[PDB]
Design a protein around this ligand. Structure first.
Ligand SMILES: [Zn+2]
Ligand SMILES: [Zn+2]
Ligand SMILES: [Zn+2]
Ligand SMILES: [Zn+2]
Ligand SMILES: [Zn+2]
Ligand SMILES: [Zn+2]
Lengths: 389, 389, 100, 389
């Protein structure tokens, strides 16, 4: 094993990152393993009072590729409610094959979609609040570094314009984002910190000065206004105990800057931000946002996975619906209706037609298509998020 | 890089799992790097209305070992409030050395203690509720598999008697825990599933039959009572929609079993359990608990890290307290009072004496002691948790 | 501040208003290492700057004691209540200005 | 000084009714006084969740007249929100001159507009609730008699049709209003009290009989109906402990009167009335209201006054906006936008144009116009109140 308390890719692929009951159960089944073919579907037990931005499927395919199983799933970036128009639980993925062949991967499969999805969904909420103002994922520091890249990836797919993590940036194929830290002003002083920042930032990227280290934001803004000229943004990461009314403070700063003819200096805010916070601060004048904890710590959706068919016959347990299923969605209004797997489409009068969403990504362990890059996926989410305001 | 969206140990050690601003800032500082020695302390900005079971330090030492820095920290498993008796923020770790030498590790350092601590703290809350009844960590499936081991480790340290993850079990040096899955009853039927379970479980471990797959828990209990004899536990993972009043259902089942002289069959419950849920169900008769999501998804504590001294002089930013500090605790009542680093201890009249808690774990990159194994750490937490009811 | 100190002699205590321009914390440090005959520091901190007045006061008090100037007492004013007074005093405030 | 605990006009004009820090501070400044010219603006720190009916300016002019200062203000009776369309604090008055010349009057200046404004604003709320039914200011008895006239003046300006105070009436140039007191019925009995009341009231004024002294309002109404004929109103000042459901009691009384063909007798109510109470009771049939305590004790708006410019240069403190300013309002929709003092007006597309509201009332201590009488001011408020329902 490795140094830190993590499971390597090798380990998760070997089925070591799972609840032991699986291998012990498969072991007990013995030769019956050769006669037990199943179909399992993942549904959200979790929060049912919100829509979801599905994410984490890419990880699932990396794990099941090579095994003799068929896999169906809703594409990443698809946004929808966990229950259909008639309150039926929506299946996001279906796996078919010999139970003993992939049963041990249930733990990891759920793990890949539960946490990631909560993150991308929360980022989409923030996306709606930020409107045409950009926001960036800044929270990987609140979670274990090992999952640093997946967090920034889902945050990006969910709507984030940029990301701060190096590996996350590499993974989404974008340049990392970053502004000067408080540490710089503490070590060299504001004036030198700002000078150094401006000198180490040339066109192709915007200038950003952190101003809350020592002074009152208002006077820091006036000082910067009459000291430099090539400053695109002023960033306020104002301490909680100093944040009596962040909105009024921002209006005050904006007025003082415009008074000296420097309304060209835009305002960026960060620190304990929410979809709620973002909306208010932007209505107050903030034009850029740094969002961390609320997104990186987003509660995971509670996905469950269970057998829905055995050797071709529909079969489940109490609290679950049997049979393999398809997920139909109206091409015009996005209404959804889950149906038995033998119903490919349904005619409607509303607008357009109802087509299957649960699509096959793996056939006998082989990919059925080239997987989309992160940019393409978030591009899809942004279109999808349109249907939700 | 690796297959999944994770950062390898190699990567986190190279400073790749971090916000880019650090390396870009260190790069900008240049030769000044040789003249900037600092001391940074991690304090909880986070939830201040609860105590905390500190955890994740082991990971921090693995990363800084080998670098020329001194490290002080509160031992893992120590339980205390984020603010002292006088409302002062408590520092959990202090790092000393050339800023440019470890500045990039801030992201990972916070990551190691934020999420882990939330998990161990939540497990301790559950520990208090479970009393003398055992509970096990079953939630790694709700989070990304890569951090599967650290979750079970912190859950164990926080009070969990057992863990389900293979790697988590290996890491704490305990046998994984596991009961038959619903899948087994769906594939082979209850009778065969139970028979197989009993046959594949011999003394050294207790027998546990999952009974909610097909029947009403009450009649499943009666049937099992008059069908087998060597059954130690009956487990109810009763579906949410079937859980009208779990407490009354459990009393009903317990009565029916005692009526047939089988009160020897103990009851275990699992599924959407909390410290609150555990308490109620145990008061109703449950003697074993499976706890997952509430613990594995525990919100991370919001730790922040900032320079508190530069080249020997106290220096911080707005919202932080300058100077290196010690954390004194009364040996008898556990009252805490943070003080300047030059105050090793203080005399008191209450009970005993006040001694420093923030102890040195690294001296010039070398360990100052042999690190405790997980069992020893949770053994410490259990004693510590005594001071909180 | 200089004018205030010069126009205040024993029989009355010295009080410096510190929230006009700086962050209360750094105003406190500056005053600590600039004057000596200062009995009180007064914070009439603006509403929009008052995120957590209690924590701000503890922070200021710590920084002053760190430089051996815990002799400087703290006075607060602005939107105070019986409720506010109690909390702030438990946080270290030793004098209060109560109006509205 | 005088007998009662009050400051005479002489005293307030001498700067004796103020916080001593002003004179002691001005004294300390010495000759610097000759080189310190400033501009101070009064803004509402106070309630920001309600509009305001500005009042008390007349008092301010009486005090500053004769001093070498310029004064700008929003006219009395203007109704608007304390923050503009963009959340900027609105200045209601601006004073220009040598600081030491008027600095001591800050206490009195705020005093004149804080309490008066709360009173006129509350009266306007009542005005909206009373609709086309008249209401009168009856509460000077709840406040110190010395400020008896200003209270009735602001209540009138805010919407009151009449006032009970002698000096208040004289000041607004209206006849005081008054009905027989309970004392009269207690001393002479209801019958004699009513007879005396009717005999001492001739056309030019309406007859009003107080009926709740001894009987149940319902039977008092029947008795009066069949005893007198020239009775215009019946007044119910019903005791709190007897007021189970004032609305139903009023309907009951109104029915009984109409049954005997005396629906000509109108109903007036008084006692613990609010904008809320007035509305309900009028919907129940009350056509006249006596309103005291809720208006006379109206909480004062929290106005603050601070330097916004020094020797021609914009300059303020944290939490305030620097520079002299104008208050522009759309002539058609009343939208408001505060701007720098060098922006007299702004073009808009909505409706009409945006013109300055903050007008000069004093130039070098001389009035720039003849001040409006109370009737003219409330006439303005009533038009202004139209924009608020
Ligand atoms: Zn359709
Ligand atoms: Zn449709
Ligand atoms: Zn002690
Ligand atoms: Zn003690
Ligand atoms: Zn207009
Ligand atoms: Zn308009």
């Amino acid at each position: 094993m490795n140094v830190f308390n993590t499971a390597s890719d090798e380990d998760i692929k070997k089925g070591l990152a799972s609840d032991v009951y699986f291998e012990r159960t498969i072991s007990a089944i013995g030769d019956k393993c050769n006669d037990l073919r199943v179909a399992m579907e993942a549904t959200v037990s979790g929060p049912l009072d919100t829509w979801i931005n599905f994410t984490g499927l890419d990880e699932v395919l990396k794990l099941l590729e090579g095994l003799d199983v068929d896999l169906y799933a809703i594409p990443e970036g698809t946004i929808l409610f966990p229950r259909d128009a008639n309150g039926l639980p929506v299946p996001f993925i279906r796996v078919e094959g010999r139970y003993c062949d992939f049963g041990m991967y249930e733990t990891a499969i759920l793990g890949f979609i539960c946490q990631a999805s909560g993150i991308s969904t929360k980022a989409s909420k923030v996306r709606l609040a930020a409107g045409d103002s950009p926001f960036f994922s800044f929270g990987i520091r609140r979670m274990h570094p090992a999952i640093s890249p997946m967090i920034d990836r889902s945050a990006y797919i969910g709507g984030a314009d940029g990301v701060s993590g190096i590996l996350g940036a590499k993974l989404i194929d974008q340049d990392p984002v970053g502004t000067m830290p408080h540490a710089l002003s503490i070590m060299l002083g504001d004036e030198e910190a700002w000078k150094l920042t401006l000198e180490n930032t040339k066109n192709g990227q915007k200038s950003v000065l952190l101003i809350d280290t020592y002074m009152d934001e208002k006077f820091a803004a006036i000082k910067i206004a009459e000291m430099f000229d090539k400053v695109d943004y002023i960033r306020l990461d104002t301490p909680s105990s100093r944040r009596g009314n962040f909105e009024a403070l921002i209006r005050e700063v904006r007025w003082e800057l415009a008074l000296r003819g420097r309304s060209d200096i835009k305002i960026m805010v960060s620190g304990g931000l929410d979809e709620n916070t973002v909306k208010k601060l932007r209505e107050a004048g903030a034009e850029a946002f740094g969002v961390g904890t609320s997104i990186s710590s987003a509660k995971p959706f509670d996905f469950a996975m269970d057998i829905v068919e055995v050797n071709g016959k529909p079969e489940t347990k109490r609290g679950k619906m049997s049979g393999r299923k398809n997920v139909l969605r109206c091409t015009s209004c996005h209404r959804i209706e889950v149906v038995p797997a033998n119903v490919q489409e349904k005619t409607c009068i509303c607008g357009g037609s109802m087509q299957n969403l649960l699509v096959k990504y793996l056939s006998h362990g082989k990919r059925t298509s080239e997987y989309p890059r992160p940019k393409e996926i978030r591009s899809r989410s942004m279109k999808e998020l349109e249907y939700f305001k």
